[PDB]
Amino acid sequence: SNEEPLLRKSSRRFVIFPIQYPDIWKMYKQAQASFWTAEEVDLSKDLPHWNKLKADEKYFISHILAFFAASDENLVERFSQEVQVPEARCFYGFQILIENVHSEMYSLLIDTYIRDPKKREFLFNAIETMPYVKKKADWALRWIADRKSTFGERVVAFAAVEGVFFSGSFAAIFWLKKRGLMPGLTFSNELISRDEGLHCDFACLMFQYLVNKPSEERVREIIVDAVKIEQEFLTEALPVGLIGMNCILMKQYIEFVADRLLVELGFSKVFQAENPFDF
């Protein structure tokens, strides 16, 4: 415990400055710089684009949005608490605010593309009833809540949640951007994916200051495991084919993105998946 700089009770500087971890602080300031609120996203032109979508297209989009809306207390409680380094706590405090902005944003999008209130709950009944939500909740137990959960495991899990889970949905929404549809959804999507990446990178940097890093095998387990989940969700459950994407290519993007994390965490690739997408 005390053997860890990030957890060491002696890292809670007197107040703060002057900064001791310039790298961690730079990320905080970055976050601070990319601050934004839902209101900033213009949803004015969207409805005409929405109505130009085919029935199967509207089913896929309205569903992923709801899944986004479903996902959202790892950041709030554990890491903004266990880590003692002030620079890091400033970053987590900001990640909390932003996560809430993501939620307002998704609610806002659903609320305008789906006017009928009864349709909204017909939509969420299906959602909180599906596999991706449970298979993910269960995954969080085996790696975040369990007692044998070392701090290094949770840092890895954390980086997977931000970088591995939902990576496919961002890609799918990006895919629609190439077809030039729904400006407001696409704009908020890059804003949110940028934030997620920034969060994925932070978790990495946190991993990097670790004395007690878990085994590469243990890592590979959390990473690919979650890859499995993300993969079946977009291949089998909410087939990306529904919007004209290639079910197999998606399976490969997710794998590329996962290798990228592993290599970002210092380890070596395990899928050897090239990036299927050009965007």
Q: Which residues carry out catalysis?
A: 106
How far apart are alpha carbons 8 and 11 in whole angstroms?
6
The string of DSSP letters for 224-259 reads HHHHHHHHHIIIIIS-GGGGT--HHHHHHHHHHHHH
Count other Cβ atoms within 10 Å, centred on residue 58: 16
How far apart are alpha carbons 25 and 20 in whole angstroms?
9
Numbers of helices and strands, H then E, in the chain? 12, 0
Per CB under 8 A, does 74 bind a copy of itself? no
Single residue of 60, 94, 139, 271 touching a copy of itself by CB under 8 A:
94
Taking CB under 5 A as the binding criterion, the range among 21-29, 44-52, 65-73, 205-213 that sits at the site for Fe ion is 65-73
> Which two tokens mark 279?
């965007």
Residue 49 annotated as lining a ligand binding site: no
**Residue 86 interacting partner from Fe ion, a copy of itself, none (CB closer than 5 to 8 Å by kind):** a copy of itself
Q: Which 8-47 residues touch a copy of itself, going by CB under 8 A?
A: 13-18, 32, 35, 37
C-beta closer to a copy of itself: residue 126 or 248: 126
**In the complex, minimum distance from the CB of residue 61 to a copy of itself, in angstroms, rounded to a whole number:** 15
**Residue 141 interacting partner from a copy of itself, Fe ion, none (CB closer than 5 to 8 Å by kind):** none
Contacts of 142 (CB under 8 A, 6+ apart): none
CB of 262 within 8 A of CB of 163?
A: no
**Residue 199 interacting partner from Fe ion, a copy of itself, none (CB closer than 5 to 8 Å by kind):** Fe ion
- Burial degree of 223 (CB within 10 A; 0-12, 13-18, 19+): buried
Give the binding site for a copy of itself (CB under 8 A): 13-18, 32, 35, 37, 66, 69-70, 73, 76-77, 80-81, 86, 89-90, 93-94, 96-97, 99-100, 103-104, 106-108, 110-111, 119-120, 124, 127-128
